[PDB]
Symmetry: C2
Subunit: 113 residues, 2 copies
Amino acid sequence: GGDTIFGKIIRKEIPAKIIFEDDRCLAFHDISPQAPTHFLVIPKKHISQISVAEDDDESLLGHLMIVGKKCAADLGLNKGYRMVVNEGSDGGQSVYHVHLHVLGGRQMHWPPG
Amino acid sequence: GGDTIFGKIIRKEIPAKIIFEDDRCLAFHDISPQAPTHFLVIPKKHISQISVAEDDDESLLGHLMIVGKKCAADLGLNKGYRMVVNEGSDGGQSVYHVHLHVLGGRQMHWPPG
């Protein structure tokens, strides 16, 4: 889904350290990790940014969190983690294809950036 | 919903600057902001933390996000923003009632804590 490097990964055109996959999303380790465990859960549907997600995409967005929570458990993150969604410039969004970050394996700090 | 502070805000026992409310959630300003605009979206249903959300909770979860992106827009966060959900000790989760932070109004940095 899409014209970003994330679309290419979804189409298996380029490799990724794929963690989990179903009919509507894909989870894989972040190529530039900011913690001992740092992964991403993305919808196969190309939604460029969270700000343009439709009301109808509600449960799908919720599914990215459920999948993230499940993957977190199976990667051994028993002491906690942080989920992050970045939007546009001030938010530091690196790829215009909606993605949920999950970071753990270390004490995350405050503020969150 | 709950034995926490969020419980008191949901039961309207303690005041908060509400930005939006419906039958499923509440969105209000964080009293200790880490950015010019800093608010929380919480489900009225008491879910202690994300690690324990049920599969049936995914629609509710995506709703917190849909509501977050709408409020961010109403609050004028056109340059971007960052959404964060903290889980447990390593995640910095202070209050054990699920809540989504929305931060904006300034450049957010990387890593997010």
